[PDB]
GROMACS .gro file of C-alpha atoms in nm:
model
  118
    1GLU     CA    1   7.817   2.944   7.293
    2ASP     CA    2   7.698   2.556   7.325
    3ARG     CA    3   7.575   2.294   7.071
    4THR     CA    4   7.347   2.571   6.871
    5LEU     CA    5   7.669   2.761   6.777
    6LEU     CA    6   7.766   2.666   6.523
    7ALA     CA    7   7.396   2.616   6.385
    8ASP     CA    8   7.357   3.022   6.460
    9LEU     CA    9   7.690   3.140   6.225
   10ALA     CA   10   7.619   2.939   5.940
   11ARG     CA   11   7.261   3.187   5.916
   12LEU     CA   12   7.493   3.436   5.919
   13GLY     CA   13   7.651   3.639   5.678
   14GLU     CA   14   7.941   3.747   5.844
   15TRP     CA   15   8.050   3.381   5.859
   16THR     CA   16   8.331   3.284   5.624
   17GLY     CA   17   8.320   2.968   5.700
   18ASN     CA   18   8.683   2.897   5.888
   19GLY     CA   19   8.669   2.962   6.281
   20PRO     CA   20   9.009   3.161   6.266
   21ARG     CA   21   8.975   3.417   6.020
   22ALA     CA   22   8.619   3.442   6.125
   23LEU     CA   23   8.770   3.641   6.437
   24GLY     CA   24   9.042   3.826   6.309
   25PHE     CA   25   8.790   3.940   6.024
   26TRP     CA   26   8.520   4.019   6.288
   27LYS     CA   27   8.819   4.249   6.512
   28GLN     CA   28   8.894   4.432   6.235
   29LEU     CA   29   8.553   4.553   6.189
   30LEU     CA   30   8.509   4.622   6.509
   31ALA     CA   31   8.825   4.780   6.529
   32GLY     CA   32   8.702   5.045   6.312
   33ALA     CA   33   8.328   5.077   6.408
   34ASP     CA   34   8.118   4.880   6.713
   35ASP     CA   35   7.837   4.704   6.713
   36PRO     CA   36   7.704   4.467   7.033
   37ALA     CA   37   7.576   4.133   6.820
   38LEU     CA   38   7.916   4.122   6.618
   39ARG     CA   39   8.046   4.162   6.906
   40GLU     CA   40   7.937   3.871   7.106
   41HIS     CA   41   7.958   3.654   6.804
   42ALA     CA   42   8.288   3.740   6.809
   43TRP     CA   43   8.376   3.636   7.223
   44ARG     CA   44   8.141   3.320   7.153
   45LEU     CA   45   8.380   3.254   6.837
   46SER     CA   46   8.660   3.245   7.072
   47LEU     CA   47   8.533   3.059   7.369
   48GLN     CA   48   8.433   2.783   7.113
   49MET     CA   49   8.803   2.872   6.973
   50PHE     CA   50   8.993   2.847   7.359
   51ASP     CA   51   9.074   3.162   7.206
   52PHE     CA   52   9.075   3.324   7.586
   53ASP     CA   53   9.273   3.661   7.488
   54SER     CA   54   9.084   3.703   7.180
   55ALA     CA   55   8.771   3.614   7.466
   56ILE     CA   56   8.857   3.909   7.764
   57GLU     CA   57   8.975   4.147   7.463
   58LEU     CA   58   8.643   4.134   7.302
   59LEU     CA   59   8.486   4.058   7.637
   60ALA     CA   60   8.655   4.354   7.933
   61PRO     CA   61   8.570   4.695   7.736
   62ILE     CA   62   8.146   4.566   7.722
   63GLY     CA   63   8.184   4.641   8.131
   64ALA     CA   64   8.387   4.941   8.105
   65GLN     CA   65   8.116   5.080   7.968
   66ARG     CA   66   7.775   4.908   8.067
   67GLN     CA   67   7.687   4.664   8.306
   68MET     CA   68   7.753   4.356   8.151
   69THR     CA   69   7.474   4.025   8.185
   70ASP     CA   70   7.499   3.707   8.363
   71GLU     CA   71   7.709   3.559   8.032
   72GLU     CA   72   7.838   3.839   7.960
   73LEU     CA   73   8.024   3.851   8.331
   74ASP     CA   74   8.098   3.457   8.363
   75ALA     CA   75   8.247   3.454   8.005
   76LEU     CA   76   8.502   3.721   8.116
   77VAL     CA   77   8.591   3.526   8.437
   78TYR     CA   78   8.577   3.210   8.317
   79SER     CA   79   8.816   3.299   8.027
   80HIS     CA   80   9.051   3.481   8.348
   81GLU     CA   81   9.058   3.106   8.516
   82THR     CA   82   9.084   2.867   8.221
   83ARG     CA   83   9.444   3.041   8.087
   84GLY     CA   84   9.645   3.120   8.409
   85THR     CA   85   9.612   3.535   8.508
   86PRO     CA   86   9.397   3.422   8.776
   87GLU     CA   87   9.556   3.760   8.957
   88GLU     CA   88   9.404   3.973   8.682
   89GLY     CA   89   9.120   3.803   8.718
   90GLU     CA   90   9.051   3.882   9.016
   91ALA     CA   91   9.215   4.256   9.004
   92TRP     CA   92   8.955   4.338   8.738
   93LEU     CA   93   8.652   4.218   8.941
   94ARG     CA   94   8.739   4.419   9.172
   95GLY     CA   95   8.691   4.818   8.997
   96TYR     CA   96   8.412   4.600   8.806
   97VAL     CA   97   8.240   4.567   9.122
   98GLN     CA   98   8.235   4.947   9.259
   99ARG     CA   99   8.121   5.049   8.884
  100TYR     CA  100   7.735   4.848   8.792
  101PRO     CA  101   7.785   4.722   9.146
  102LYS     CA  102   7.453   4.583   9.153
  103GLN     CA  103   7.483   4.291   8.936
  104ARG     CA  104   7.510   3.979   9.289
  105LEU     CA  105   7.697   3.704   8.972
  106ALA     CA  106   7.971   3.920   9.050
  107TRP     CA  107   8.071   3.940   9.415
  108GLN     CA  108   7.966   3.569   9.418
  109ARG     CA  109   8.237   3.536   9.139
  110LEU     CA  110   8.430   3.736   9.389
  111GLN     CA  111   8.399   3.581   9.730
  112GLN     CA  112   8.470   3.253   9.505
  113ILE     CA  113   8.801   3.448   9.434
  114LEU     CA  114   8.917   3.580   9.813
  115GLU     CA  115   8.794   3.198   9.914
  116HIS     CA  116   9.128   3.077   9.739
  117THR     CA  117   9.227   3.180  10.104
  118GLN     CA  118   9.610   2.945  10.169
   0.00000   0.00000   0.00000
């Protein structure tokens, strides 16, 4: 999230007060059993911390099991762009648009990517 995010985290009991330690904790909890809300707090926080690696790790599995929201999709595409790596971003986007081919925003991001000719 943007300006809400700290106020948002402070309401959760599972927010232990420290960006990094919270993320590793939640990653460990999610490794045992998934929790959608905790997964979201996790990747929101990943973006907050400029941890695009963790953002991609937490976001990509969603679109292997379900059609992502526009917010969920922009996050994973932005994360790939922002960290280097836009090749494997375009790679992932192709094929995401083959399952769930009805999310228009996915095709728009893929079209933008390929509008990088030369």
